Amino acid sequence: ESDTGLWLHNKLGATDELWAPPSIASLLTAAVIDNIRLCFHGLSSAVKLKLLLGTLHLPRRTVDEMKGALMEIIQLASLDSDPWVLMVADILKSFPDTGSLNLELEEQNPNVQDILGELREKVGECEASAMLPLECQYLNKNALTTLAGPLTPPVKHFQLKRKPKSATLRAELLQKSTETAQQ
Amino acid sequence: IMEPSIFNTLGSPENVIQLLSENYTAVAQTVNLLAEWLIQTGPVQVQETVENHLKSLLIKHFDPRKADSIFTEEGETPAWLEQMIAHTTWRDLFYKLAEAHPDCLMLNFTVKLISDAGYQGEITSVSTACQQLEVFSRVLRTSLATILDGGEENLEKNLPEFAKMVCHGEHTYLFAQAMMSVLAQEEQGGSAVRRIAQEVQRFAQEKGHDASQITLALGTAASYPRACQALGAMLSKGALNPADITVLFKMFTSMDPPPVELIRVPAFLDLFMQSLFKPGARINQDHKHKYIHILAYAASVVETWKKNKRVSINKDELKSTSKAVETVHNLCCNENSELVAELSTLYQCIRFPVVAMGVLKWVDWTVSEPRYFQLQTDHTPVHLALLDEISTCHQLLHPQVLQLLVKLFETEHSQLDVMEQLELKKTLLDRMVHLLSRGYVLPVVSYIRKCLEKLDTDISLIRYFVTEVLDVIAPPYTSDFVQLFLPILENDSIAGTIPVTEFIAHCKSNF
Amino acid sequence: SNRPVMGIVQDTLTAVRKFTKRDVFLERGEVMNLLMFLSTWDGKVPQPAILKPRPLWTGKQIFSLIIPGHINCIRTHSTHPDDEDSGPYKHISPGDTKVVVENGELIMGILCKKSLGTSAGSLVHISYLEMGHDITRLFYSNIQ
Amino acid sequence: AGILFEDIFDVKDIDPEGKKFDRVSRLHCESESFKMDLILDVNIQIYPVDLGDKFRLVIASTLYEDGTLDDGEYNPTDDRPSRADQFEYVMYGKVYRIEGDETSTEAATRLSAYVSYGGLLMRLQGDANNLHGFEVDSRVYLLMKKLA
Amino acid sequence: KAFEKKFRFDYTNERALRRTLQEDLVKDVLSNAHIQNELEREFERMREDREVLRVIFPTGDSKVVLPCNLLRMIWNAQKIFHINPRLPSDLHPIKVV
């Protein structure tokens, strides 16, 4: 870092992409984030978001031993002016502690409360009729029934007059399988 | 002109002749006259084409330039814009006008008011929604309500317009992974929304989006450094490194259970699916035993999560699923034929659910390989009979079974003879009708309706499909099913060539 | 068939493929020896591709000297992947398999039958089309 | 002073697609002063570049400090000084294509400069202003020295 | 749509046309009704040529055998005259017509 503000303004100041690069981990060393203590408010909204979103990629052991600096950085983000930064800061306020995030908004952004509220009964009204998690596809019958309740059976769109042709060929592969196995 | 005419009590002399041109003369008189005349000539289309003529001329204006310096807008522009946004073509136009010049205080300030004033569903909001908090939360509420009442089919339709909004940046993604996770953690319908969350995570995995760092901390799986650090390298790298599997094996086996949802992540189990069920994956004995143990552990145990305590474990069904996965692993890796001889136990393994998508992926990596159908000689290949049994035993894999099977149906095998190409298509249609008997009705017939009405596939295959369907089904019929099936027989490219009488007799009674 | 009837063959073709590879670096004396088998050479030794640590020329420079005037060509090497022209590195070949001659200079690419044989649009074909016949005769002889 | 480009580069890749050539390895390098991606093909067989090496890359149209132009002819017995004296890897070539993110009515802000050194290619992507000196069909010298 | 986008000269977008041409040529193209009419007539003539080609080749192969290689000739003209593609040109489109 020749000048930290300008250097992050080149690396994370690309207005074209708000992505975070895979090389961000080498950029976010302790010697870099330590220098951002002095000059953080003058930095733009996009660089602040990309920097805070870069905290996720760092592993647990390289963060928790030095959690205080991150706690100070997110506290400095708690006083910011961009609402996106403010809300993620109030969400990421417990990331470097153990990784168990705040996972609730009842102190900032009063308008999202009605967003939660209007979906809160609608989700209950359409509990199992909406969709079933992909994890339960692999889980057995007892595990699926205990996890998300019993399966919803198919609607009887029609009756049947005789079995399809697949039954005969399935029986034929069974009888062939047994004779070839015994032979 | 209308304004530059008599500036003073005359006022230029040239402008007084310009006043004669417009004023309250032809420019105004004939406007009402021709507005009633084009109406009387034929007409509600007149006002629509009038508005179209205005709308084309509107777009030339330089809205982002003059609107920035005012900084006030007299209190949210009540004089002219507030009545304007209530007009359909104008409010739709405003979204188009915003895209030309983003990053402006005036446009982003004004759009926050129209979103809650009647435009709850903000169309074409791919980028505009990202900038503003209120509009993003509002359209997220609309999206989550729409997907919740849409059912199952709409998930294909709901994915692209909604999930692409978080592609601009990650800041729009973790927030879009926050409130619905709170809705998922509750016992009142918490499964379906975590389902769409994991679906979004999987789309992120196939669009290159990094979702390996946020979903682990969101399911409170970050409580242990070893578990989070172990799983992070697996999901980030995308491989089964032995160190993380060994620590997980010695961890979960002890009397200290991690959260069960971390080992049940669909991206992790799909990674196991890809790593293990591939025919070309060669693993030593010990690591294979640990892999099959992890899958069995991830698919057998019932646990009571009281948020501080849990005392529950099952070992027998873990052993049974370990045996099934191991035996199917042996069949998949050996590959040699003696394949037919192994169906005595293979269908027993088909009865287990965790194995069904394993053999499904194995079949996908087998049949998609070219010349496989050319190399095959049976009237019905054994792999497709395995998918028939998969369709019979279970119903959760039916979207995946149909997706693989239509992927095969649309495929062209140029190396094959044309008649065997048709007989292969008829075999795939035999799987269609088999799956139709197993409850997957509407998506299959929707595929057929698309393939016939829109595409130009062979009509013989459609005729074979309709004949098999009519010969296998019997009344009663639901109104949606006859609503979907009846236009096929009314196409008249099929009806004159050959159940049909019974169906047309019953359908008229139905509707 | 409106294509050149005669082209570079056998020993010259294999050796020019081995010569135009990106890894071929010629010492000074080797460059001196090769430069004087050029009948169309202007006598000015080109600046080396690598100046330091050691002066090394590449076979592309020498073949640029062989190619006459300012003919322009794009040709595709036999081992060229198809997907290379779709993804990144499309115009900076990791395999050096895209042949482009600009201002009569082989800026990149490895030469084969597709660019020096009898096929239409090859280097000898456009050399004949743009520079008459005697210049192309000298081109053939200089290559060999 | 004839310098079109100057930077300190770090390299974290060595032939990601695989070893295409024994004597040449593609170098995916990343800048440390600005935002700038460099793809480079070097002669490792005489100048071995290990992973994580710090090297100062300079693009100059003339090696000579005074700025007099070079004729593109080898002249080892030259008596003038050069910028090649302080740097330990110098290689000369031309630039065959400049690309950018320009639209029909917006300027390119992310330029790309494809430069070929006798068949050894180099691509240099990044911001337009630092690349603004590069122009097509111009001979340049790739100057490099390895830092610590 | 692609043919119109890639082959019809547009004299209504001042910004992009100023990007690709010198300002005096921009003024001459915009002011003249005659030049714009001639350019549109050329476009309609090449549209007629397009439908004639579609009549001639019902199979959609564009490969034909014609005397002068125009693409290589334009490349040669670019290289000989040291054409800078980044800069705007001094070539009047009506001169091309």
Curated annotation (Swiss-Prot), chain A:
Intrachain disulfide bonds: none
Tissue distribution: Ubiquitous. Expressed in heart, brain, placenta, liver, skeletal muscle, kidney and pancreas. Expressed at lower level in adult lung. Expressed in fetal brain, lung, liver and kidney.
UniProt-recorded name of the protein: Negative elongation factor A
Entire-sequence positions represented here: 6 to 188 of 528
Task performed by this protein: Essential component of the NELF complex, a complex that negatively regulates the elongation of transcription by RNA polymerase II. The NELF complex, which acts via an association with the DSIF complex and causes transcriptional pausing, is counteracted by the P-TEFb kinase complex. (Microbial infection) The NELF complex is involved in HIV-1 latency possibly involving recruitment of PCF11 to paused RNA polymerase II.
Similarity section: Belongs to the NELF-A family.
Protein location: Nucleus
Superkingdom of this protein's organism: Eukaryota
Domain note: The HDAg-like domain is essential for transcriptional repression, and mediates the interaction with the RNA polymerase II complex.
Domain annotation HDAg: ranges: 84-183
Region (NELF-C/D-binding): 120-183
Source organism of this protein record: Homo sapiens
Assembly notes: The NELF complex is composed of NELFA, NELFB, NELFCD (isoform NELF-C or isoform NELF-D) and NELFE; NELFA and NELFCD form a stable subcomplex that binds to the N-terminus of NELFB. In vitro, the NELFA:NELFCD subcomplex binds to ssDNA and ssRNA in a sequence- and structure-dependent manner. Interacts with the RNA polymerase II complex when it is not phosphorylated by P-TEFb.
Modified residues (Phosphothreonine): 152
From Swiss-Prot, chain B:
One example GO MF annotation: RNA binding
Main location: nucleus
GO CC, any one term: nucleoplasm
Keyword terms of this UniProt record: Nucleus, Repressor, RNA-binding, Transcription, Transcription regulation
Localization in the cell: Nucleus
UniProt-reported outcome of changing residue 226 to Q: Reduces RNA binding
Disulfide bonds: none
UniProt-listed GO biological process terms: negative regulation of transcription elongation by RNA polymerase II
Family membership: Belongs to the NELF-D family.
Function: Essential component of the NELF complex, a complex that negatively regulates the elongation of transcription by RNA polymerase II. The NELF complex, which acts via an association with the DSIF complex and causes transcriptional pausing, is counteracted by the P-TEFb kinase complex.
UniProt protein name: Negative elongation factor C/D
Organism of origin: Homo sapiens
